[PDB]
Amino acid sequence: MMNEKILIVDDQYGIRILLNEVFNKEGYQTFQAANGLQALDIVTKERPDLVLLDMKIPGMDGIEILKRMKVIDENIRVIIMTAYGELDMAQESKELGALTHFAKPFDIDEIRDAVKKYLPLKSNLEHHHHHH
């Protein structure tokens, strides 16, 4: 449609943007971030619904940023592609510590799969009985 939105924060040369060709068109508004602050830029600019955050990202500690992300929306699906033991550290540090987790920036095939594994696909979806 068009209302699909995701952020991807990592320092992989062309994975961030290949996610764009991968979803940004039709899958989701997948944007690229070199810092969580850059992700904050887009989260306030385009307001993607999902966030991919790596704290292992050169620049800033994405951990803090993703904490703020749930803190901004609470509907935003905060997904972690950093030290996935942050459901230990990042969670107890603040609030949620991100949901779907991965310790490695992996091949996008598993990522697109993970997207269609985790995403609702239910009846109520987000919060709306009978989409109108």
* Residue 45, marked binder: no
Q: Is 49 annotated as a binding residue?
A: no
How far apart are the C-alpha atoms of 18 and 70, rounded to whole Å? 25
Domain range enclosing 105: 1-132
Q: How determined?
A: NMR
How many domains, the chain? 1
Cα 117 to Cα 72: distance, rounded to the nearest angstrom? 25
Any binding-site annotation on 56? Answer: yes
**CA atoms 128, 24, 100, 65: torsion sign:** negative
Which of 37, 49, 52 lies closest to 3 in space, CA to CA?
Answer: 49
In 3D space, the residue among 79, 88, 78, 87 whose CA is nearest the CA of residue 106 turns out to be 79
The burial of 8, by beta-carbon neighbours within 10 Å (0-12 exposed, 13-18 middle, 19 or more buried), is given as buried
- State how beta strands 29-33 and 77-80 pair: unpaired
Q: What is the CATH number of the domain that holds 13?
A: 3.40.50.2300
Question: Does 73 appear as a known binding residue?
Answer: no
CA 25 to CA 14: how far, in whole Å?
Answer: 17
Contact 57, 32 (CB under 8 A): no
Q: Are 5 and 20 in contact (CB under 8 A)?
A: no
